[PDB]
Amino acid sequence: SMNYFVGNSLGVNLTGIEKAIINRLNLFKEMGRPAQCVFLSWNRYLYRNAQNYITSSDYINMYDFFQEATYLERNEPFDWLSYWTDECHYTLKHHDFRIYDQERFLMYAHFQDPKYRILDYVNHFDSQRRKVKRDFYDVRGFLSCSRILVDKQQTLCEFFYNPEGDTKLEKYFSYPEVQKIIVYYANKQYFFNNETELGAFFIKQLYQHGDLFFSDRNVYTAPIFNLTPESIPVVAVLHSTHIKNIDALDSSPFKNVYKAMFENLSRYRAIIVSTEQQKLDVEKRINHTIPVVNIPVGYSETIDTPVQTLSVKLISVARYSPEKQLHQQIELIKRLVSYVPKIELHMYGFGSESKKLNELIQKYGLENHVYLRGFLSNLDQEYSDAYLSLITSNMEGFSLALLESLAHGVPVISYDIKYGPNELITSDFNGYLITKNDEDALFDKVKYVIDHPEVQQRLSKGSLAKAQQYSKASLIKQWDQFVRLILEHH
Amino acid sequence: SMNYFVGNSLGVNLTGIEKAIINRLNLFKEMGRPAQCVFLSWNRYLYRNAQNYITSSDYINMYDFFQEATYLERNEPFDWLSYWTDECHYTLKHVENSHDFRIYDQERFLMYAHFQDPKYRILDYVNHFDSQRRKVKRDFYDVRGFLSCSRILVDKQQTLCEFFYNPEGDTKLEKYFSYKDGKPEVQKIIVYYANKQYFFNNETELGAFFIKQLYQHGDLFFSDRNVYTAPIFNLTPESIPVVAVLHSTHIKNIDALDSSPFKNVYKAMFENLSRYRAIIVSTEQQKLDVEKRINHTIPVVNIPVGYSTPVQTLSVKLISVARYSPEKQLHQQIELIKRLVSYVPKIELHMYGFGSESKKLNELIQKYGLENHVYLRGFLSNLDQEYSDAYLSLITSNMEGFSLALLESLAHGVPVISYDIKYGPNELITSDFNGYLITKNDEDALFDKVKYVIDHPEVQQRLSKGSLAKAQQYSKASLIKQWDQFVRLILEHH
C-alpha cells in the first residue's frame, strides 16, 4: 500500500506546502509506511528543484508519468555545441547561440551553464524568419515539449515527448486556454477537455486497492479529486486558516483555495489541520459532516548544539510581513533599553517590511540593539545564547521555528492568537501567552523574565519538556494511527 | 548502376508523361538495364494508382523514402470499427449517404471518420475536434493502412503545419505553411534522416536532397516533369548526370522558332542547359528545331515515346481519334463529310474522344443533317474492334504531338490524311506510302485527297500496307536498341 501527498510542483524556493509534503514523506519512510509526493504541473526543472530534498523514486509528476520519465535521473552530459559543428556543420554566432546553415538562420539556442552541458530551449525559424516551433528541454537532457506558434507568437498546440522522442501528449489551445488534450497510454489514445480531467485520469492510473491520497494543494487537487470515484480514498490537508476572516467563524466564506474541497466534503474521508484549536473551529463550522483531526506539521529534532550558554539576547524568527507586526518588538526594545542597557533583538526572516523596520531602528538610535539578520538556513548556533523568543503577530499557523527554539530551551512570549501559540505555549510553563496587541503586558512579562533569570531558567526547562512532547516519534505514531483508522473505516 | 525516370506522381487516369515513364520502365526491364520511376509529390494513394502498371520495387516516391515506406505493400485489413467499438468503448454514428462515421466518447464528439469503400475496409481520414467542436487536426491514412500525415489547422480550417510518419508512427518530416493568394505555401521543411535533422525552405530543396541521396556513380537521371524536376536538378551538382525529356512543343509560338519564348514548364531547364547531358524529344522534326534553337550546345536525340486480331475487313468508315478540343479543329471533319456525302452516301465518320467542344460538334451534325453519318463516339479505353473496318484516319489539328493513337491505327493497317503541322504527323506519315500530308487549313485540298482515296480502293490498299510497314519501324526491339545505345553513349561521355 502507498501514501500519496498530492501538491502541484517544487519552486527554486520551496513553499510551506512543499516542505510539509516532503517533511511528511520522510516520516512515512521512517515508520516503514511507503510514501511518494505527487506533482501535477508540467515542470521540466522539477528534477533540479527536487535534487536537494527528495530522491526521484520518492515522487511521481503527472507529465513525467505519461512521458515515461518518472524515476528517470540526469542523462550523461551532451556536447550540443560539438554535435551542431562536428556532425551538422552548422555556424554558431554567440549563454545563447544563433545557429546558421552557411548563410541561413535556423535556430536560437539558450543554455543554463557557461559550460553549455545543459540545453534549455531552441527556437526554430522559417524562410521569412517567423518563429514556428519552440523546443523545451528537461534539465535531465531529453526534449520534453515542442510548442507550435501562429500569428503574433500565440501558442496553438504543444507536443510532449518521452526520452526516446515518441509523442505521449498533445494539447490544443484557443484564445490561451486548453480546449483538448490527447494522451497515448496503454497502447491507445485518451481524450480530455482540460488539465483537471487529465489530473483525474492520472489519479485513477496511480490508485491500487489499499493506497491513500492526501489533497495538499487544494486549489488544484480538490477539483481533480472531485472527478475521481469515491472508492479512491482521499484526505484534505489545510496548511492555513480555513476562512477569509477568523473573527467571523460561523459567517466567513471559506478561502478561495479551499472552496472546491468544502463544497464536496462527502468526497473526503477527513480533514487534517495542524492545531487542536483549528480542529474545533473546523468541526463546528462543517457540523461534524466528516472527521477533522489535528496532526502537527513538524517535530522537535534531537539537539546537536550547546544549549542556554547565556548581553540579554531576544530573538524573533518570523517573515518580515505585516501580520508578524515586528515593529511592536522594536518599540518593546525602545522601552526596555533604558532598564536593560546591553539588550539585543535579533530578527531572522525576509519580506516586504525590511525598509520600514530598518528605518524605525535608525530613527530610535537602536542600531546597536536591534538587528534585521535576514534569512539563515541554519539557526542552531543563534539559539545557544537566546534568552527568549517573541511572537507579536495578529495571526499565526503551527510554527516549526517555535518548535525548534523550544527544543533549544528558549522560552517564548507570544500574543494569544490563532493558530499555533496555544498549542505550543502553556503560560508559566515554557513562556507566557499575552492578550493580542497588549504591548504594556508584553513589556511587563518580558521585563519580569529579564529581571528574574531563575524564571527564565525554569521556563527554559518547560521549553525542553514541551519540545519533548512534539518529538519525531510522537508524530510518527499519530500519522501511523490516522492512516490505519482512515483505511480501516473506508 | 540504376536509371531513374523522375516524374511527379501517377493519377487514377494516367497522363501522357506517366505513360511515357511506365512504357520506358517496361523497355528497360525487357532490355536488362535496371530502371525505376521516381515520384516527388506526397500521394497516399500512389500505391493503388501504381498497382495496375508497376511493382513496388519498380518505384521510389520521395515522401515514402523519408517516411521509411519505400517498397512497402498493403497491410492485412484492420476493422477500425471493431477497435473503436470493442477496444476503445467509443460510440459510432453512421452519416447518411456516406462511408463516414461520427465517433463519440459518450456525449462527447471526438472524431469524424471517412472510409474510401462502403465496406469500411480502407480508412481514408479522421478529423479531431476540441471541446468547442473546432477541427484541430486531420489524420491522413495511406491506402496501405498506416497513418501518413497529420495536418494541424488554425482559424477557418487553414493548414498551419503537417507531420509525416513512418508506418511505426515516428515523425520523419514536418512542413510549416503561410497563406499567399488564399493558399498554403511551404515556408519550412524539417526531415529526420540518417539519425540527424535537415532543414529546407521549399520542396525544390527537399527534392534536390532526395536526388543526392539516391545517386551513386554510374547512375543516370531523366527529368520528365521539368516544371518541377528541372529546378530540382538545378540545385544538384553537375557530377550527377541528368537527361531532359520534352513531352510537348518547346516554345509558346511554334511559328517563331528563333524568337518565341520557351514554354513556362521548360523555362528552368532551357535557362540552365549546361546542367543536362542531352535533351530527348519524340520526333526527328522537333529534334532539328531544338538543336537549331539551342545552337547545338548539348545533344538532342529523338526517341519515340512508345512502340507498336483481324485487319482491314472493309459503308466507307472514316475515323478521328482526338480530344474534342479546339486545336483538333474537328468541325472541319464535319464540313468535309457535309461535302463528301453527295458523292459518297454510304460514308460514316466516327470521332473517338471527349472535351468541351462536344456541344458545338452535335449542333453542326444536326445543322447539316449528318446524324446517320457523323458519330461522336466518346472516349473508348480499347479501339481494337473500331480499327478492323476503318478505311482512313483524319487529322485536321493546327498543332500536334507524337500520337501513340496514330501509331496504333497504323499497326492495324489504317492509312491517314493529316494537315502538315508540328509535331508527330511528319514522324508517322510519309506521303503516298501510308497516307498524305495537306497544307495546314486547306480544306479544299483535304476534300480532294480524301475523295481520291475513296475513289481508288487499290490506293487505300497500298497506303494500308504502308501503314503496317510504317508501324513496324516503331517495334519494341527497335525502341530497346535506341534506348540501349543512348544510355551507353551518355555514360561513356560523362
Residue numbers in the entry:
A (entry chain C): 0 to 93, 98 to 178, 183 to 317, 321 to 500
B (entry chain A): 0 to 307, 312 to 317, 321 to 500
Manuscript text:
Two glycosyltransferases (GTases), SdgB and SdgA, are responsible for the glycosylation of S. aureus SDR proteins such as ClfA and ClfB. SdgB first appends N-acetyl­glucosamine (GlcNAc) moieties onto serine residues (O-glycosylation) within the SDR domain using uridine diphos­phate N-acetylglucosamine (UDP-GlcNAc) as a donor substrate. The subsequent addition of GlcNAc to the glycoproteins is catalyzed by the second enzyme, SdgA, yielding glycosylated SDR proteins in which each SD repeat is decorated with GlcNAc disaccharide moieties.
In addition to the dimerization role, the inserted domain was found to serve as a binding platform for the SD repeats before and after glycosylation. Altogether, the extensive snapshots of SdgB complexes in multiple states provided a mechanistic insight into how SdgB recognizes and glycosylates the clustered serine residues in the SDR proteins.
